[PDB]
Each structure stands twice: as structure tokens, then as C-alpha cells.
Amino acid sequence: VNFEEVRELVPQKYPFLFIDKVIELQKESRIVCLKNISGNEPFFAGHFPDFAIMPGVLIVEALAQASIILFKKSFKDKVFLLASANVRFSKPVFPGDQLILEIDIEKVISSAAIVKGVAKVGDKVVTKATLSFGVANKD
Amino acid sequence: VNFEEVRELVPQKYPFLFIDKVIELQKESRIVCLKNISGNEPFFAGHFPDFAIMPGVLIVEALAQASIILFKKSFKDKVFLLASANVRFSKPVFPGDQLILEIDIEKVISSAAIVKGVAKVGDKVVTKATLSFGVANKD
Amino acid sequence: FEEVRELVPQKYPFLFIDKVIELQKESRIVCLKNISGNEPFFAGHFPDFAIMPGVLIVEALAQASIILFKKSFSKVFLLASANVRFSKPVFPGDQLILEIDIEKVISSAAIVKGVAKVGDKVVTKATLSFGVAN
Amino acid sequence: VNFEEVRELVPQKYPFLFIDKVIELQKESRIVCLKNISGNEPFFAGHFPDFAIMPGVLIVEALAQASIILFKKSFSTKVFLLASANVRFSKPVFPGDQLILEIDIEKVISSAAIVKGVAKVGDKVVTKATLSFGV
Amino acid sequence: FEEVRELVPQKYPFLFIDKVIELQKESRIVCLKNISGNEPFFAGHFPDFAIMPGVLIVEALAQASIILFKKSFSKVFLLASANVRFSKPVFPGDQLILEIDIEKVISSAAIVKGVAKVGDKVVTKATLSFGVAN
Amino acid sequence: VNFEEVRELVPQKYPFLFIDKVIELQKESRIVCLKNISGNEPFFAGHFPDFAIMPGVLIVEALAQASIILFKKSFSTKVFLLASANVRFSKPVFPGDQLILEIDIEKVISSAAIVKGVAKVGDKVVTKATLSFGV
Amino acid sequence: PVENLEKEITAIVAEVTELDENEIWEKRDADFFKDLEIDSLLALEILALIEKKFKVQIPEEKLVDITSLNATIEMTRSTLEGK
Amino acid sequence: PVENLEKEITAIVAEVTELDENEIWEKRDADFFKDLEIDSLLALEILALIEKKFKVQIPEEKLVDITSLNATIEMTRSTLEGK
Amino acid sequence: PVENLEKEITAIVAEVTELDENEIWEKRDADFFKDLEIDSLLALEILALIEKKFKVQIPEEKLVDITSLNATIEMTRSTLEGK
Amino acid sequence: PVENLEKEITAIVAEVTELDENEIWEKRDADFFKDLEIDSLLALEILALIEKKFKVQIPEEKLVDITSLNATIEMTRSTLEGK
Amino acid sequence: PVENLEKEITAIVAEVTELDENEIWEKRDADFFKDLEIDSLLALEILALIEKKFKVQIPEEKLVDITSLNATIEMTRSTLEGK
Amino acid sequence: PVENLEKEITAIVAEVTELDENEIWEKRDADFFKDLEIDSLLALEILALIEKKFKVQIPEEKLVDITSLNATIEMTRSTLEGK
Prior knowledge:
Chain A is α+β, with helices and mostly antiparallel strands. Chain A is 22% helix and 40% strand. In chain A, strands 1-2-4-5-6-3 form a six-stranded antiparallel beta sheet, with helices on one face. Chain A has one domain. Chain A is globular, with a radius of gyration of 15 Å. The longest helix of chain G is centred in the first third of the chain and has 15 residues, at 2-16. Strand 3 of chain C pairs antiparallel with strand 3 of chain D.
């Protein structure tokens, strides 16, 4: 397990942390993160309480957090702002699911980056996304 | 004010409600909603606590909630599942901002819908989005 | 707002100040808090009808007074006494504008007149008194 | 008297409920309530993060919640909105303190009510407050 | 999981059951709870090191036992007594698999043997006892 | 003894802190702590939504938190992980009840410790528990 | 006393809405809410201050006749003879 | 065996009830319900142990008659007489 | 005026301290700090009222000498002697 | 312009399926859902992107006419037979 | 294919700015940021979408060469001068 | 007593790890953790049950020699003579 590493890598604290473990990390190309999904989270009761179904925007945020982990471990210090998300929601995600976040970098600039992520539940692909990030660290 | 109407229209309860008032509602074409943004929300302290900046995915979720208000008031009963989001994050959003959500419908199907939203802070446009929804109400 | 974070002796769950508009040092302060339905007290207090507990408006006037003090005098402030009138209710969607004028400031205590407004309609009007500590 | 009768009598639910028990209840004259305060409250971590001290605003809130339960036991069957509060905060109140809140009627009209409240930890007054509610 | 919601006498903040895998009625139950760093007790208990309080694993075994009871006998269960051993810690990312076998079920009480596993490594092992009420 | 000394002595912070005050402390023999419980807790609305009854798991947790503060006052300068618990739950505990938690040492070794704990509301035992901690 | 009843009533109103005593003095022939911005709580505060300084009783159906300054003067007269 | 049923029963009840077996030999005449600081589930525990380690069954009616160390040894004894 | 400074001071202190002015005329010899159930900010309140409605200023040194109704009338009196 | 529309439609399916154009053009007459790695949602993608490329709005009950590359091409050309 | 690339680039800018093609082709030689309703981010849009349309990868220090329709066209054709 | 020391020690271990008394009886010549899956808490429970039934003292540096069954038998012997 490498969650305590994620707690410093990802600055996002509770209740907006959507990474639990880094399965694999290929520097400057690819990252694979894990998110355990439980019914004991606030958005499940906050989003349509009569039926627990994770909002897709939070899967996009998990994809973005994996992307930022990949950036910070494999680019000196800057910040990364999400510029765009082009997402495709294939299938719903439910409590008890292990959500596998897969980021592959396409392009890297001094001032910009483009990544392509897929989130999987076993063999299922449930979201595809093209994300783009900018830098704005002033000092 | 028409927030108590939104509380029944939007099923989303705390802490995932991103609509406060419906400024305007043109049935089957257009909706304009308002979200007051304060620093007293959990994601501001949860997302990068050293600097309060609203995550863009939550602006997309506010756009989706406005879209669902437009759907439920101006289409008998079904449910609406978010199928895709193609978003463009123009400028950051900070506490103290009034966030104006503007949905214009493009296409409506028995089983699908496409909307185009912009979120504004005064004269500023901060996010543009094309969203697409499906229906899956079983019974 | 980043300055408001350090300047206020309060963090996330009990912060009722979003921004300071004007700062007439040692004279007055005006602040804005957005009131959104995504806050906890709208569920606890009254579910069937989301109304802001006016006591939190009192707390907001108090916090704005603290901000006015920290910027007017280069250090602990405890709200000693309050005398409030609730004229109008406050709902989600409202922009609360809290205005603090000071009436008496001594070495050991201070007295302020507060007024909360939605637009140009006075919703609450208070007079607050704070004691100072090291 | 039972904390489960306070469920429906008082609509205030979990995150903003500041009453635990009813010690006495003399109808139309006086009520006294117990709010037991603990360090496991959200406002403590929100208010002055290092040293835990519950804010007087919530002590006034608990006094008002005692006033409403006093109101509801005879005038029942009408929202009782808090109209005014003249409050003096005497002494800080810390986790582990039992806050006893004594509400006394001074006036009841068709659409208005006036109350005198005292909040103590022991028999030590830490808050006094003249409250007024409209209907 | 929608069935787990009604079947468990607990809602959001204190729900420790994500899914039931097998239901041998009147014999045994096996459940899964995902353990994620996005839960409150990982901050309160120990910040510098996120570890699941084993007491919540006890509560989870308890809730799974309640599920086993509600589906085996067509009605209030209060956990009367516990005897637990914590073998291994549980961290974020782990899939807790909680297995409840029943040893004695009478009209007025019941006794279960629980075991929590991450993979095939026993992390906690408990014996629980519940009393029944109307 | 002060709830602000319990800040650094006991790392457990806001949402999972179940101790308010230290009544007595006889070092290396016995400690007794006060956890004041109120209806304004998240587990009450989480546990059995209609009737508020605090779960015994958290009473055991508060007993363990008393054991750790007992441990830290002489053996200081090493995490004290809870290894085992043999617990009997006697009577329910409701909002407004002061839970007093008496922890007694039975054994202390280099890397292990054994404790007897009793939780009462008044002098009425509602929970007994033999606890064991490793290091 | 006329002088006394009069100046104490205008004192109470100049306290509650805080306009210079003469300025409220004159405008009695208007309505407290239509032209004097007086609330339920302003009226209640005036009535309570009256019951306090005047050690006088008040039944508040009288409040329907609480619409102008001279009106409350007349009702206050009636109550100070009420015993 | 009578003293070996004493062996089994007394052994397991001394394991459970947390007292000295010497004073148990003295307190055969001790009442579970009021004198031995017992639970009803404490009786469930001792009864499950006899069930398992004597290898024969007992219905739940037995539960009413669990009262005293003499009396509970007598109830388990009448069972093993049938059981 | 001496009895009109009594008018001003006694009026505002009876407004604040919540007691009967008859017993105040009896309790001129009452001590704020221990006998009148006061606050130090209660002295701040009465002193702000004298500041505002007598139209002349007082530094904060005065605060130490606020002790009793005789003594506080004397302190405000020595001020208005200078103030 | 059956050639322009036809190979641009080949390309639309190669984009929406993120596949090779040769791949799908080899698959003129095999069904979408079973083999072409597509559900209702990718069908919505084809519908919208072709509706905007070739300057039409298809009365989208024509949903019933989209099962493969063949159904899509024939449906589209019937739409501009509407044109 | 300067005509194909040139009017498809006109169309790329008309898409990214969601503007009329005639509009931007009228604006060959006016700057992006000041007048063409574009920031760094729409520039990233042009960069990526043209990089994928015309089968190139532009060493994107050429960022310095994108200020208008003119800079973009000349930069792109210099890139396929690289080709 | 040899029989007694022996069967009570194997009873304690057959309680803590619950294998049939003979099956643990035989495997004494191995390690409690390398071949018997015994934890810090299993060893501590055996030691506590020994201090309880045996009313015997134990210093737990002895625990380093707690690796096999016969080993704890020898140390238990040494302590039952320890007085």
C-alpha cells in the first residue's frame, strides 16, 4: 500500500480525495490508480438518495487527481490547473466497486499538458476522458 | 425566491445541491439558475486547502442540475442520466461569486437530450459545456 | 479571501465571511457572505423550510467586527454582549451584506453597530460588544 | 421530557440541535433544559481551531430552542420565529460542561412572546438573554 | 446494495456494509466493505497515519450479522457482547471481507463467529453475541 | 487534565474523539475520564435513525482512548495499537448521559499492556471490557 | 400629565426608530407602517417600554389602534385611567 | 461421572464468570441471577459450552431453570441425564 | 444642574442595570462591582450613554474610578465638571 | 456526392469507434451492437456529429435505421433524399 | 495543398472561436488575443486539433508563432516545410 | 506434575489456536510463528491464561524462549519452582 504517499502527493484532503493507492507508475507516460467505492460517502446520500449511483463528475475528478499524481511524480516546482475535460460516461458505478483510473499522457508543454484516461470496473470500461491542464504557479 | 421549489424539483439533498434559485425558465428551450458560492463549503477546504478555488467538475454538476430542472419542469415521469460532458474551463471561480448557470437545449429525443450551458460570473464566462443525457427510468 | 482566512479566527465549518468590500480603518467595515442551500444549518434547523438562523447572521456581524479590529489595531476578541433585532428572514440565494460601524473603542473593550442587508432591505440590525484579551 | 419526544416536538435535526433533556417543565411559566456539550462538535474545530470554546451564538440558539419547546406544550394546535435577543455573555463554556438553560415567560400575546433565559454550568450563570419571538 | 440499505438499521455516516456476496440462510453470511481514504474516521483517529479503527471492523461484522439475521428469520437486535482479536491492521485501498457464521440461535439471543479478511489474510477475528427485541 | 492538554497527548481529532475531561489520574494504576455525549453527534443520525442510541463500539473506543492517555503520562519518551477487546454491553446510553470511563492496569510489559475498563452513567455499569494493546 | 404622557411617548418612539424627537413629534397624523417604517417588533418594543416605565398593563388588541403616535397617546391615556 | 460433570461444568463456569474455583466449591449455593453478577447471555455462554463439549443437545426451555450453581449444575445434570 | 445630572445619569443607569429607580434613590450607596450585578462592559455602556447624551468627552482613565452609584455619579460629575 | 459523404461517414465511424477507417469500411454490412463495439451512446455520437457535418437535422425516429455502416449510410442518404 | 490546408484552417479557427468562417477569413492579419476572442487555451485548441487533422506533431516552441490567422497558417505551412 | 503441567499447557494452546490437542501435542519441535501461525497476541493470551490458571508470575523476557511448546513447558516448570 502507498496511500500515505498519496496523502502528501495529492494535496486534496477529506472529503475530496479520490485516490487510495497507486498500482503502477510509469514516469512521463502512464499511471494506474485505485479508488475503492463505498456507500459510506457523502455524495451517495447527497446525489439522488433513493438510489446510490456515483456522479460521473467525481470519476472525472479521480481521473484528474491521478493525472496530477503522475505530473508531480513525473514532470523545480509548479501547480497544475484543469483546463478541459471531454468525457464519455459508458456505465454506472456502484458501491463495492474497485474503480481503476488509467492515465496516459499525450502531450506535455512547459505550460500545458494533455492526458487520456479510462476508468474501469474489472473488465468494464465506464468512462473515457480527454483532459487538459495548465500551469499557473506564480511563486 | 424559489429555492423550496428547487428542493423538490432537484432530488439532490445536501451536500450535493448546486442550485439555489431559478432566475428564468423558458420551457423546452432555456433555463438560468443561480448558485451563491461561499467559502463555507466542504470542497473548498477539501480541494487544495492552501488556496480556495472551486473545482470545475462541480460547475459542470451545477450545469447538469440546472439541465435536469429544465427537463423536469419542461419535458408522464422519467429519470435523466448524464451521458457526456464536453467542458471548457475559462476562468477560476472564488468564494463570494454569484455563479449564473445558463442552459439552452439543442436536441430532445424520447431517449436522449443535448444541452449547451455557459456559467458566468458577472460579464465573465468561466465555463462552456456541451452535455448529453439519457433516460433509464425502469418503473 | 485568502487574507480573510488568516484574519478570521475561524475555519471551514463555522466561517461566515466571504469577502470584505471596504475597509475604513478604525471607522467601519463592510463584508459579503453568500447564503447558499449547500450549508449544514439549513437542514438541521428546519427541513420543511430552509431559513438561515438569524443567530448565524449575528455571528457573521461578529466575525466582520473581528476583521475590522485586526486591521485597525496592529490580540484576542471575545464577544461580550449582543442586542439584536431580526427584521426580515434570509433565504438561500441571498447576498448578505454586513456593515459594522464602531461607536466606542477603548483599551479593554469595544462596541460596534452592525446591520445586515439583502440588497437595500435591512434584515437584521444589531449592536455588539467585544472584550479584548492577549 | 424524553429526548425522543424532542424529535417531533422540536423540528431541529442533527447538525443544529442544541438540546438533550428536559429537567423541569412548569407549563406557561418556566422550562429548564439540559444541553450536554462535548469536544466532538463541528463548531469547536471551526471556532478558534487551537483552543476549544463553544460560541455564545449557539448558547443563545439553545436558549431559543428551550423557549420553543416551552411554547409548544400548551399553545399547540404558528412557527414561533425568533424576533429579538438582548444577550450578555458572562463566562466561557467548555467541553464536558453541562449547559442548563432556564427559560421563563414574561409575556404571551396572540402573535408574540417574550422570554428571560439564563444559561449556567452548575449554578453559575454564564449567559443571560431577553428573547422575543413573533408568530 | 439498495436492499442492504433497508436491511441494515443504519444510514450514511455509520454504514459499514457495501455488498453481500453469499447468503446461506440460517447458516452464514459474507459481505464486502471497501475501505477508502475518503471516510471521516481516518482523519479523526490518527492524521499522520491513516489506519482503520478496528472497532469499526467490529461494527461491520456486527452489521453483517444483523443482515444475516433479518434474512434468516422473518425484530430488533442489540449487540450484547463482543470478544475480538485484532491480528492485522487495515489501510485505505483494502477490500474488507467479513464472514459471519452462527453458532447458537435461540428465541431470545444469538451468537456468531466473525472473521474479517483482506484477500486471504485474517486481519480481525471476533465472536459476537446479540440480544433480540420487538 | 485539561481538555486542551488532551489535544497533543491524544492525537485523535475532531470527528473521532470520545473524551472530554480527566476526573482522576493515579499514574500506572488507574485513570477515569468523562465523555459527555449529546444528541448532536453524527453516529446517532447514522445509527438506527429514529431512536437515538450510541453504539457500544464507540463506548469501547472511548475506553481505549482513556487507556492511551493513562499510558502516555509516565511511559512517555510507541503507538499503543489496540490488540484485543473482550466486552460486555450492559445498558444503553442516551444523549444527556455523562459516560464515565474507569481504566485500570492489570499488566504492563515492554511491548504490551492489559487493561480493565468500566463505563457507567452515574455509578451504574453499562459496559465492561478487558482490553489489550500492543506496541 | 399631558406634557409628561406626551414627551415620554415621543421619547419611546424616538428611541425605537431613533428620529429626532421633534421630527417624529410632528408626523403623528400618518401610519406607523405606511409612512413611518415601523415593524411588529418596533411596535412590540414601544409597548414593552410603555409597560415598563409606565408600570402599566396593556391588552394588545389595542395594537390594532396602534397605527399613529397620537393614537398610542390616546390608548395610553385610557390605560393610565384604566385602574 | 458426577464429580467429572463437576469437572466440566465448574471448569467452564469458572472460565466464564471470573471467580475463584475454591470459593465456587464454597459457592455452589450461589444464585446466578442476583448473586453471581451474571447476564442471561452469560447463561447462553455456559450453555453453549456444555452443548459443544459434552456433545449432546439441549432445547431452550432449559433457559428458564438456570438459576444457581447448585441449580445450574442440577439443570445441566438432568439434561445429561436425558441429554 | 445637580438633580438634572441625577436625571440623566440615574435615568440611563436605570435603563441599563434593570432595577427600580425608587430603590436606586435608596441605593445611591450601592457598589457596581459587587452589589449591582454589573459588568465592566456595563460601565462601558453607561459611560457611552453619558458620552453621547451629554455631548462632551471622557478619556478611559475614568474607567478605574467607576465603583458605586454615589461614586459613579461622582465620577461622571467630576468629568462634567471638566467635561 | 455519395463518395464524399460515404468516405467521410466511414471516417465518422472510425472516429467514434476510434478505430481504423479500413477496419470499418471492411465492415459495411455487419451490425453495430453485436460486433462493432458500440451502444446507444456511440449511436448518439454518430447522430449528432453527422447532423452537424452534413448540414441536416434528421427526424430521429430514424434511430430505427441505424444498425451498421450500411444502415447509417443508407439512412443518411435517405435524409438528403429528403433534402 | 495550400488551398485545402488554408480553408480548413480558416474552418478550424471558425470552429474553435465558434465564429463564422467568412468572419475570420476577413481577419487574416489581426491578432488573436486583442480582438479575436481567444486566450492561451483556445490556442491549445488550435494546436491540438490541427496537429491531429494534418498528421503532424509541431515542436510547440512554435507557440511563439501563433498570434492570428496569419501566424497560424504560416507556422503550420512551415511545419509541413519540415515535413 | 508432568502429566498436569503438560496437558494444561497443551490445553491452553489448543484453546488459543484451536487445533485438536494431540495435533498440537506432536508438533512441539517447530516454531510457533514459522510453522504454527502464532501471533504476539496468541503468545500473550497463552501467557495470561498461564498466569491465571497457574496463579504464577511471568517475566516476559522469557517470551524470547517462547517459540515452541516444549519450550514454554520448560519455562513454566522453572517458574512453578520459581518460588
